[PDB]
Write a protein that binds this ligand. Sequence first.
Ligand SMILES: CC(C)n1c2ccc([C@@H]3CCCCO3)cc2c2c3c(c4c(c21)CCc1nn(C)cc1-4)C(=O)N=C3
Length: 292
Amino acid sequence: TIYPVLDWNDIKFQDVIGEGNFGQVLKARIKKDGLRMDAAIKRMFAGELEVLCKLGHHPNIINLLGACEHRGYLYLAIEYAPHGNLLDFLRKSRVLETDPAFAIANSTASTLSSQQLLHFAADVARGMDYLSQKQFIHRDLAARNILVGENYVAKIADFGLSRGQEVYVKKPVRWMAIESLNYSVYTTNSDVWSYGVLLWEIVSLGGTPYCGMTCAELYEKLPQGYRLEKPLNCDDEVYDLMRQCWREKPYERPSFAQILVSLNRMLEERKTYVNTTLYEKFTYAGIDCSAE
Ligand SMILES: CC(C)n1c2ccc([C@@H]3CCCCO3)cc2c2c3c(c4c(c21)CCc1nn(C)cc1-4)C(=O)N=C3
């Protein structure tokens, strides 16, 4: 009873809407507190379960509605994010590709604006600050694991449940901190590195990071000091923010709280930080289906 119990009989499964590291996610309708509502279902040890059930609501963390035991398996009922994962949401906005007529007429390269992209980044930083302050270590921060829920509020999903100052996970190379590629240990510091790549994904409207490069090249190239280049449509303040997230020394990277402050500053300025207008020779950052 450590969680809002739910009867498998009150779950109306619909369609498959995605798939995480473990299992498929299914959209469904359930009855909670006598009321019928939308939800995503994921088939999920004991300690982690309590960790999740205890977490506690936060507007930028996908929320647990209830769990259900069935055939020896535990099914989690999750708050529903109608808009889907951030990665596809970003790629669906590349109107120059999805609706060129619209793009030329409005002279825009995305249905989304600079502010919206900054909000997604701020939303995630807020959620990560909340999680890291409680010793949580995500381990797999990336656009694909961010959900765009009600009112387009970004929500963090698929975060690791093993709490502590650092966690070893024997076992996503393009999002991993150098110290994780070498040691398989994760900390909030390596979460910050990944957040930086997430920020780069946001600004590039879902481009594959290090497009054109093999994982192998990264292993040797990253330690040499190599890092993702600034997208031409990105302001320097935003790019510097990413660079801070990728400092070789983990303890030199900012905290999520500091990241959020820098983002809120940008959000407050009338200034535009991520250019989405169409300029003479515009092209999107590439998506390497060979790596995905
Ligand atoms: C593949 C990933 C991105 N996956 C998840 C992966 C992991 C979780 C867990 C639940 C327990 C707390 C930590 O995190 C939730 C989701 C998760 C959710 C939802 C979705 C997806 C999820 C992907 C496919 C999808 N399409 N649409 C329209 C919504 C979703 C959703 O609505 N509520 C939760």
